[PDB]
Design goal:
Radius of gyration: 23 Å
PDB class: hydrolase
Assembly: monomeric
Entry title: INPP5D PanDDA analysis group deposition -- Crystal Structure of the phosphatase and C2 domains of SHIP1 in complex with Z1722836661
Distance between the termini: 27 Å
Number of strands: 21
Order of helices and strands: EHEEHEEEEEHHEHHHEEEEEEEEHEEEE
Bound molecules: 2-(1H-imidazol-1-yl)ethyl dimethylcarbamate
Strand order of the largest sheet: 2-11-12-1-3-5-4
Keywords: PanDDA, XChemExplorer, Alzheimers, hydrolase
Name: Phosphatidylinositol 3,4,5-trisphosphate 5-phosphatase 1
Structural class: mainly beta
Number of domains: 2
Largest sheet: 7 strands, mixed
């Protein structure tokens, strides 16, 4: 039985509006409705992993697992295994996998973050799950962010709190938040970003939706506009949206958007919006292709429609050689030439680097770099040819070229990371000096850059 080099992942997000689901929700798992939909010829082909995020979920874990497993069984005739389930208030994540994957999945982690203080702490936040699938780390975040058209900044703040404080993945990666811990990170939920147009334009918006003319609406979608101004979700991707706004519907039909202010909305308008979203971030030069992104048309118990997205994701095998794991492979080395960090910090401390990778027995600390002043005000930290030679556990190029090196630049004075990034070893050549580059972030905000050259030696 060969180990896979690709899997398919289903991501679902549904705000259930505190109502039980209808008797049939199979269209969700089949990626059928509006948008980028899945070919009918694939309907019986199970995805490898199904990750279901709900918000305003009124069901017990048991009740929802029942419905999910029986839905997938009906579609695929496969009885899925429960990998993980985690609930914060009415925010829930379920991970199901094909039974053949049970012994490929390990290191399962779950966590939650509650957003806001006092007033604003009590129902919003995120749940998440991570695990290893053979040699590949996978993370999944389901967030329900702050509601309301005039709270996009609160949503951005909720995002930064979730990525700082959600404790998933390898705890040995101590300088790195969830946006660097995983080969593939999927972040979905009722993100609650709105179409920012005047209230008086509600009927115009509805008209545009009926004509399937989304362009003048997406140009005002707060998540796209905040992303474009680097205010949120820096270095995440989203597939093009080709489905109608998924909020706010009258229940039991999809023929009507309910946008007018009511006591029940706190006298707020809910103009039709793409509240319900799926984004991802994968390490550089790893295969990840979105194969569906849309909304169902036939599930109408909630004022939201379910959203689906599916992905092809590259995975690697759990590599064993004669040497590592348990020792180094002298035939392998990673060298860095002419490297420097460019930092936005106004501070003057010395900096050193940390290299972290599962291709190393443990993380590697560099000597301090030499600070110089950039021509436009910047701090430039020069490492020249001074960076250590990294000694991987396995030299086989079929392993080593699939790996990644996480870099943290840390203050000598405080040992706090000022910036984190990631370098792919999927090089055009071995034994050859080649440019490398990563942006550096801290709390998911841009803090600088790291660039230089790499020289990778493999056994070939
Ligand atoms: C879509 N959007 C909000 C945006 O900023 O796209 C340009 C940057 N980009 C290019 C590939 N991925 C992100």
């Amino acid at each position: 039985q060969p180990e896979p080099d690709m899997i398919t992942i289903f991501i679902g997000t549904w705000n259930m509006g505190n109502a039980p689901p209808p008797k049939k929700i199979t269209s969700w798992f089949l990626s059928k409705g509006q948008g980028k939909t899945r070919d009918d010829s694939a309907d019986y082909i199970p995805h490898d992993i199904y990750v279901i995020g709900t918000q305003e979920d009124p069901l017990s874990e048991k009740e929802w697992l029942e419905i999910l497993k029986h839905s997938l069984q009906e579609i695929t005739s496969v009885t899925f295994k429960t990998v993980a389930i985690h609930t914060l208030w009415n925010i829930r994540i379920v991970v199901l996998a094909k039974p053949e994957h049970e012994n490929r999945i390990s290191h399962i982690c779950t966590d939650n973050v509650k957003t806001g203080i006092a007033n604003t702490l009590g129902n919003k936040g995120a749940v998440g799950v991570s695990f290893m699938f053979n040699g590949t780390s996978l993370g999944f975040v389901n967030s329900h962010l702050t509601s309301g058209s005039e709270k996009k900044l609160r949503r951005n703040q909720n995002y930064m709190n979730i990525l700082r404080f959600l404790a998933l993945g390898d705890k040995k990666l101590s300088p790195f938040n969830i946006t660097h811990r995983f080969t593939h990170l999927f972040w979905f939920g009722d993100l609650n970003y709105r179409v920012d147009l005047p209230t008086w334009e509600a009927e115009t918006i509805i008209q545009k939706i009926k004509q399937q003319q989304y362009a003048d609406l997406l140009s005002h979608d707060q998540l796209l506009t905040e992303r474009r101004e680097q205010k949120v979700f820096l270095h995440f991707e989203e597939e093009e949206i080709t489905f109608a706004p998924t909020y706010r519907f009258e229940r039991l039909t999809r023929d009507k958007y309910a946008y007018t202010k009511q006591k029940a909305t706190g006298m707020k308008y809910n103009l039709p919006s793409w509240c319900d979203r799926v984004l991802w971030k994968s390490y550089p030069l790893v295969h990840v292709v979105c194969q569906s992104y849309g909304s169902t048309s036939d599930i109408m118990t909630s004022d939201h429609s379910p959203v689906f997205a599916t992905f092809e994701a590259g995975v690697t095998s759990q590599f064993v050689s004669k040497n590592g794991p348990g020792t180094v492979d002298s035939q392998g080395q990673i060298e860095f030439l002419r490297c420097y960090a460019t930092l936005k910090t106004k501070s003057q401390t010395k900096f050193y680097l940390e290299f972290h990778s599962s291709c190393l027995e443990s993380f590697v600390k560099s000597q301090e770099g030499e600070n110089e002043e950039g021509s436009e005000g910047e701090l430039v930290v020069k490492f020249g040819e001074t960076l250590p030679k990294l000694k991987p556990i396995i030299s086989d190029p079929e392993y080593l070229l699939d790996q990644h090196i996480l870099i943290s630049i840390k203050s000598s004075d405080s040992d706090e990371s000022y910036g984190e990034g990631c370098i792919a070893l999927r090089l055009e050549a071995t034994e050859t000096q080649l440019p490398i580059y990563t942006p550096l972030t801290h709390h998911g905000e841009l803090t600088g850059h790291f660039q230089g050259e790499i020289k990778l030696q493999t056994s070939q």
